[PDB]
Amino acid sequence: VEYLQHEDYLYRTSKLKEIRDLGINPYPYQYTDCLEVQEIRNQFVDNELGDSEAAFRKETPKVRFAGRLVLFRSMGKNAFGQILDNDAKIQVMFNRDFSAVAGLAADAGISPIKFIEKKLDLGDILGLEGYLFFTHSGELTVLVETVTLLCKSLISLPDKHAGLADKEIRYRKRWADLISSEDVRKTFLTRSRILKLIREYMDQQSFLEVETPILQTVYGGAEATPFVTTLQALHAEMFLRISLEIALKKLLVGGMSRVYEIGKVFRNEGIDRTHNPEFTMIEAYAAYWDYNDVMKCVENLVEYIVRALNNGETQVQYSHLKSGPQVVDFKAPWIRMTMKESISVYGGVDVDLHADHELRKILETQTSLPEKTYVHASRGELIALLFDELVCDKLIAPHHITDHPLETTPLCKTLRSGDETLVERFESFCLGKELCNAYSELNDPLQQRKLLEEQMRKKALNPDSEYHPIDEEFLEALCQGMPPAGGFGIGIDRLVMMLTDAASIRDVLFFPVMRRI
């Protein structure tokens, strides 16, 4: 903790005894009956309003507000400052004869203007009561009648313009980002706005929002390494959920026809520009829908969010791809292709012309996959691998990629046409990244067992594979009966990244996962 020895800390802390000896509490209890700076600007900026002399004569509107002192200049009889309040700034003016310090007696040893000069500091949080006016240059300003010290800050303001090291530190010390950077402030406001837009759209579709456990005795609904923890009351290993799917499907068996949940899931994997081990996703299930109904719902949801954030526009610019800035159009309907078509269109491989061995030669010679990944892969697995290596990077515009091999998931019905090698699944891609996963949901309880047992026997032969056993409570609930349903999941942090031009998932998380010092 190197700041405890910095000059500025020792200098500021020594002002505490000085301020308290003047009978002033440097950490008081409240600052009631005030207005937000932005609300003052909203009410009075576009207004006929007086000059400094009208404020000196107490003729202009009186206001109370509070915030952080981020600029100060003494001009003798007068001093000027800037107050930052919740992403808004306003100028303040102190005058030797007009301005008082709350708590500073008239017979104290120091004048108000010198108290302001010498006992306050940049970074201190002040309560300001005074009179509005406009400078002739047009700057909205407050002539301060009383300044109240609300918090004596003990370290200096952050460097406003962060170098690379400061930017890394501020992923932990996020308060320094929020004080310093209008852009970080907008990014997180937009994130909150996006969450409200999602809830509003879902609720207008009569989806009910629910909560289901993060700590479970099993984990499933996705392919991921889990987090493990011990519950002391039962002396039991628990897993943190990796998805929402199984719990929500039980609520369908329970009779709820439309449910969704927005919550954290945990995948104990690597960390990079698109991967934080703790992330936020929505899963939503609608009885009597299929993946086609889900496809219209997902693209309409996103278009609606984009239109609400961009004054009706559906085009959005994203600046940080290795290939340069791109403009992506979220206007529905999005591009729709089967996995097989996308491999043909973007990979240059018409898959159904090549035997399994030819598909391995393509993977072996045209990709950098290790031999163990394809040498014994089934035809469907080979097709999915071709998609991963030859297609996924190329899907910059929004795409729905449909009709995946059966091997990709055990929880999805096969194509209603009768092709049992493909499922009624789509994944949505934008900016080279997966955004959405969606199924015509499997509710045949015998078929569901068959697929999960198949998945367990296949996994049990891979050394690096996670042994989780069959969820029998899930199978029993399907025996009770799940309606036909369509479901989807959306990685919300990734979506926020697309709609805020964030280079990394760390820019949309207040406190992302960081290495220890």
Ligand X SMILES: N[C@@H](CCCC[NH3+])C(=O)O
How many whole angstroms separate alpha carbon 420 and alpha carbon 299? 27
| Closest among 256, 262, 255 to 214, alpha carbons compared | 262
Of the residues 444, 453, 454, 466, which one makes contact with a second copy according to CB under 8 A = 444
How many whole angstroms separate alpha carbon 83 and alpha carbon 72? 9
Binding partner of 494, given ligand FYB, ligand X, a second copy, none, CB within 5-8 angstroms per partner class: ligand FYB
Q: Is 221 in the site for ligand X (CB under 6 A)?
A: yes
Residue 493 CB contacts under 8 Å (≥ 6 apart), including other chains? 276, 279, 280, 505, 508, 509
DSSP conformational letter for 440:
E
Binding partner of 508, given ligand X, a second copy, ligand FYB, none, CB within 5-8 angstroms per partner class: none
Of the residues 140, 247, 295, 343, which one makes contact with a second copy according to CB under 8 A = 247
Shortest CB 278 distance to ligand X, Å: 14
Binding partner of 473, given ligand FYB, ligand X, a second copy, none, CB within 5-8 angstroms per partner class: a second copy
Beta bridge partners of 88: 85
| Closest among 335, 266, 272 to 497, alpha carbons compared | 272
How many whole angstroms separate alpha carbon 152 and alpha carbon 159? 19
Amino acid at 230: T
Residue 203 CB contacts under 8 Å (≥ 6 apart), including other chains? 209
Shortest CB 376 distance to a second copy, Å: 27
Binding partner of 405, given ligand FYB, ligand X, a second copy, none, CB within 5-8 angstroms per partner class: none
Of the residues 44, 52, 60, 67, which one makes contact with a second copy according to CB under 8 A = 67
Residue 484 token pair:
């036909």
Q: Which residue has the tokens 């996994």?
A: 459
Shortest CB 129 distance to ligand X, Å: 27
The answer to whether 382 and 359 have CB atoms below 8 angstroms apart is yes
Residues in 482-501 that interact with a second copy by CB under 8 A: 482-484, 486
Q: Is 176 in the site for a second copy (CB under 8 A)?
A: yes
Q: 288 vs 152, 197, 252, 484, CA distance in Å?
A: 60, 25, 11, 5
Binding partner of 490, given a second copy, ligand X, ligand FYB, none, CB within 5-8 angstroms per partner class: ligand FYB
Shortest CB 435 distance to ligand FYB, Å: 6
Q: 165 vs 126, 162, 501, 503, CA distance in Å?
A: 30, 8, 22, 17
DSSP conformational letter for 221:
S
Only segment of 83-91, 305-313, 343-351, 483-491 that touches ligand X (CB under 6 A): 483-491
The alpha-carbon radius of gyration of the chain (Å, integer) is 30
Of the residues 37, 197, 222, 339, which one makes contact with ligand X according to CB under 6 A = 222
Q: Is 85 in the site for ligand X (CB under 6 A)?
A: no
- How many C-beta neighbours within 10 Å does residue 339 have? 24
Binding partner of 438, given ligand FYB, a second copy, ligand X, none, CB within 5-8 angstroms per partner class: ligand X
Q: Between residues 165 and 233, which has the closer beta carbon with respect to ligand FYB?
A: 233
Q: Between residues 281 and 306, which has the closer beta carbon with respect to ligand FYB?
A: 281
Q: Is 31 in the site for a second copy (CB under 8 A)?
A: yes
Shortest CB 483 distance to a second copy, Å: 5
Q: Which residues bind ligand X (CB under 6 A)?
A: 221-222, 243, 245, 283, 437-439, 441, 487-489
